[PDB]
Amino acid sequence: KVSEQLKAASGILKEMFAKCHAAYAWPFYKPVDVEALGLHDYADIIKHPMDMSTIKSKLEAREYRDAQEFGADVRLMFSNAYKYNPPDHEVVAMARKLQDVFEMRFAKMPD
Amino acid sequence: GPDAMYVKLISSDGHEFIVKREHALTSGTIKAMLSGPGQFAENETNEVNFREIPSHVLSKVCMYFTYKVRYTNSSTEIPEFPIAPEIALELLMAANFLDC
Amino acid sequence: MSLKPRVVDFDETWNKLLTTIKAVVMLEYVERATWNDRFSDIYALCVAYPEPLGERLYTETKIFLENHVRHLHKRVLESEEQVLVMYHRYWEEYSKGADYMDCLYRYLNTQFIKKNEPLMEIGELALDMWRKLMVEPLQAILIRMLLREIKNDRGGEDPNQKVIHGVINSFVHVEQYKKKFPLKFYQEIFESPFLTETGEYYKQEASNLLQESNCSQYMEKVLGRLKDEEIRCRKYLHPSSYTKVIHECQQRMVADHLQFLHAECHNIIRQEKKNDMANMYVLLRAVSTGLPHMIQELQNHIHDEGLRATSNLTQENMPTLFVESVLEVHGKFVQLINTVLNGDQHFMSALDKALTSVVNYREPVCKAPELLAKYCDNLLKKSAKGMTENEVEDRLTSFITVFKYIDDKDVFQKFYARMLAKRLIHGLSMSMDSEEAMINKLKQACGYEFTSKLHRMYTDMSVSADLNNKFNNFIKNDLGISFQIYVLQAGAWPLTQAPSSTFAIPQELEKSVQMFELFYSQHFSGRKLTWLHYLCTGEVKMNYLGKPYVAMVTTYQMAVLLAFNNSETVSYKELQDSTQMNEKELTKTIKSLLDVKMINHDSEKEDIDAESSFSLNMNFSSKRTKFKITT
Amino acid sequence: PVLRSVNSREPSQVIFCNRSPRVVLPVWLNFDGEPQPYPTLPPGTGRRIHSYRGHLWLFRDAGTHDGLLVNQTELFVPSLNVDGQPIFANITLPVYTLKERCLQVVRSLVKPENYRRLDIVRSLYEDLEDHPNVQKDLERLTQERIAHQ
Amino acid sequence: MQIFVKTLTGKTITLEVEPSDTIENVKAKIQDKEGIPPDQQRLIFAGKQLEDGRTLSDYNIQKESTLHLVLRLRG
Amino acid sequence: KRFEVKKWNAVALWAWDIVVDNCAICRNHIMDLCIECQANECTVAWGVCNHAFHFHCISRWLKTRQVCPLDNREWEFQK
Amino acid sequence: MDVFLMIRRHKTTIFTDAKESSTVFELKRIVEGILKRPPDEQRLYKDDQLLDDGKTLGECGFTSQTARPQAPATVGLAFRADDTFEALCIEPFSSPPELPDVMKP
Ligand SMILES: Cc1ncsc1-c1ccc(CNC(=O)[C@@H]2C[C@@H](O)CN2C(=O)[C@@H](NC(=O)COCCOCCOCCNC(=O)C[C@@H]2N=C(c3ccc(Cl)cc3)c3c(sc(C)c3C)-n3c(C)nnc32)C(C)(C)C)cc1
Ligand SMILES: [Zn+2]
Ligand SMILES: [Zn+2]
Ligand SMILES: [Zn+2]
């Protein structure tokens, strides 16, 4: 099964790394750069960040075994933004859209 | 090779400065002096007498001409132009008079 | 001895400066030292510590300029009809001095003037004062004497160029007025009267010339006058009114005499008029719409000449006259237009439109496709007395020029296909490579979807050799007949697939066919062969006389002659039962044998019926042993 | 107004590089034309910045409010990045005239309530009073752009 | 009655389609006269896509008209 | 026999089972050379369905994909 | 790159530019073009040391970092009269006035 779930997770990740989801998915491509973005309390408040580039780089290594680790990583990545930002925000709206996409494609999870 | 395209400028105290004409035409007043009734001809020497500008100001003005000609339209870094603090007022007067 | 503000006495410095200013305005001699010195003196008055004096200097300079200008417009008014020479002499000095004065008032312009009747800079004030001088005398008197001199230039003698050009250029110097009208004073003061006078003069001259001349001599004179006007405008006017003057002259002359050239345009076209067409075109191109009528008469001339040269006769026996006539007409008039009218694709389009109607005539079915196809075929035959290898392509290169003008490409394709089949199935083509060149030309002229079922025929006629070689090589794996077969592609060749009647294959030729389908099925799968028995030819050496009679006949003749082998006399019923062909086909082949006198009917019945019995002629004789039927 | 910023909402990455011997202060033009200031840059430094396409930046001096040159021009409008690369931003001293250089030195050395005790000409008194202003520069650029079109 | 359709390779062919038949029927006729399944088909008439679930009479198709056949498209 | 036959010639038309078409890749007839060939013997390839294709065309494309350009189903290359 | 100098004799100052690879017989030629003295009698002096003929400026000790346009160097000049050289002598410039009270730090 390992092959099946790993292939499905890679497919979902690459579909979220698509060419016309860029309307609401470009922030998460690379690590958050507080120095070049102008943030002070981000590092203190959010202890653990996560992102697509690190996910993929770890994927090409023997580090990801079960799809639940990937699911927890995705949930952590969205919860970080939900925690840091106020309720009404552009990043909140775009993260909610991407979360609905992930929820659909994870209800479509072949297992 | 050697030429006579160099103007000669004379200070009030009796100093002679020999500067290239293209460098000198930066000043509007010098251009006005050299362009009109009083133009040179034959075996004459290109001279302009400044009876109201001492030597330590005219040398600064000549160095400014050289600096401006050298560091114009250059992609390299342009250093600051130094001015001693005890000549600032005289330099300001001479710059206002010479239109530069 | 410093650049510090002071307290200064104006009048001494004002006098010392006013002495030099007059020597600068009039271009006098001033030493170098004073020129350099006065710059310090102006600065001294411009930065005087109590109540700086710049407004007073401006006011005192304005009075000097106004006095100088008012005095100049005394000594120029008192001139007694020699105004122009004094004006130019007093203008050159004032201009070269007003240019130099501005360079000496630089500090006042930079500091005081450019920080705020609006005040004007010195060089802008002097030109305004001269404009005031140019208000009263310049307009009436000097515009009159300027128009008179240019009128006197039209013949007579040549007045001085420098004075006139300088006075004309003077009005342009409103230069420091760069706002939506740098050249408005010039126009309003000089250009409109000049245009009106030019119009009146050229109208009257055109009327006078038309009164005492014909249409042939009119054009050369008009061209000469136009060239003179063009070469004289550059000598006097500012480079912004050449087009207006030339346009007004052309409009006046030609438009006023328009319905007089459209009368001779018809006559010049019909005759040669080599030197008149160019003169008419060069002066009718630039005036409104005069070309269309010439277009129409050229088209009519082409149509009339083409019909008179083609539709008259063609000797009723020779189709090579059509192409030669059309080509000669086209080449002659293309050369004429290129040599005289210098392109002008309107006339080329008219020529094409007229040749299209010439070639595609239809008396109240057009014969153009038939003649074109027959020309191609007779040119491509083997040889009667025809041309050589590098002449057929030479003529066919120009043939396509005639070819493009036909409107029915389909009929030409049909006729060419039929005649190409006829030429190919008989091996009578002059050179096998020529068809490839003709196909390439037709493809380059029409398109790829137009010559496909000619290129496929070429390829088949090329591949048949290899297929025959292959079958003859792989046969030996005893027939008695030399077998050469053409394999053809159905759906492209114009051959009727449906047989006319049921035909029984000759018994002696029953193994060859079966071996052929066996081989073809073995080495070519998916193909359904069909046999057309009315294209095959056979050879027979008869062995019932004392001479080696050898004949070439068709398949139906083969079968009918073979039928007699059992007995010398056979009835119609026996032949009908054995061959199972229709009555019409058997009748035709029996008649063909009767015409060559191979057989004779037993009874006197000239027609053919159920009881028709025939027996071969006993004593047929022929001078030539080898022969072909109705050769 | 005319000169302002457009909410393109598309990311862009830039590198502010300083090659002048003075301190630099960037100012960003808002969506209504009211400029806003941003932290300063030490001489000879390169700082990575995140911005949007179609925004307006102008570079000034920290304390003297003098103007400097970016990419050998006055303004800087970022463009979308290609090949995943950042776009450099050179900062260079303009070649001042002698009058302006002397005015700067005098302004630095003299208190702004001690001008009319200098032994100079009358006009230089108001010339020294005419301080550089970002508002004045923006106004001038506005009619410059208007006349260009 | 009879209309005309153009293929992808350059030829043109004709069909006898009444103004009462559905566009699906036209697609099936094209498929059997050609080698293109109906899923990969698209019809152009006056620069307008023809919906599968309709008929000719709704689109006001007159006599002897011509239609362009193009493959399936997506954004 | 009364006579002997020496030579014979014949002609014969033919057609495919059910096919007529143009190559959909390079838009040249099935019985014609390729554009790649024209720059200078290649045969004609067929399919399980009724598509007459072109040997060089179909090979150069089957280097990447499999199915028919008109049938995105499969490829046979047998007959 | 390029070095800048100030050739000086008595009250006359000559402004020129030169490359580090040039020798003394390129300054001598310019002095000839402007002053027109004996061609082989211009002993060029730096500080208190004589410079030879073929030896370049870089060997003499000229660098482009310390001979900028804002501050060129100085090379003395000596002509020969009556077949004997005159002792080097350069006259200094003027002196600035006293700094005013208002500008004092
Ligand atoms: C070091 C330095 N050197 C001399 S000055 C300087 C410096 C210069 C600029 C900056 C930051 N740049 C700006 O503030 C830009 C420059 C100019 O284009 C105006 N500007 C703006 O951001 C303006 N426009 C907007 O902000 C657009 O409106 C969006 C709502 O405002 C968001 C305010 O927060 C900006 C900083 N980011 C955050 O607080 C969180 C961060 N935002 C985002 C983010 C925010 C909005 C969107 Cl649509 C997408 C992503 C973010 C990420 S990761 C990432 C790469 C980004 C850009 N992110 C994620 C995931 N979760 N949170 C984030 C403004 C003036 C209204 C603040 C920092 C330092
Ligand atoms: Zn092909
Ligand atoms: Zn091929
Ligand atoms: Zn298929």
Numbering used by the authors:
A (entry chain F): 349 to 459
B (entry chain D): 13 to 112
C (entry chain A): 1 to 116, 134 to 381, 384 to 496, 502 to 655
D (entry chain H): 61 to 209
E (entry chain U): 1 to 75
F (entry chain R): 20 to 59, 67 to 105
G (entry chain G): 1 to 105
What does the literature reporting this entry say, word for word?
Cullin-RING ubiquitin ligases (CRLs) comprise one of the most important cellular regulatory systems.
Similar to the neddylated CRL2FEM1C priming structure, the map (3.4 Å resolution) allowed for the placement of previous structures. We reasoned that the density corresponded to UBE2R2’s unique C-terminal tail, important for processive poly-ubiquitin chain formation. Although the density was less visible after post-processing, these maps still enabled assignment of the backbone atoms for 15 UBE2R2 tail residues, illuminating interaction with CUL2. Although several Lys residues were targeted, the results were consistent with Lys368 being ubiquitylated to the greatest extent.
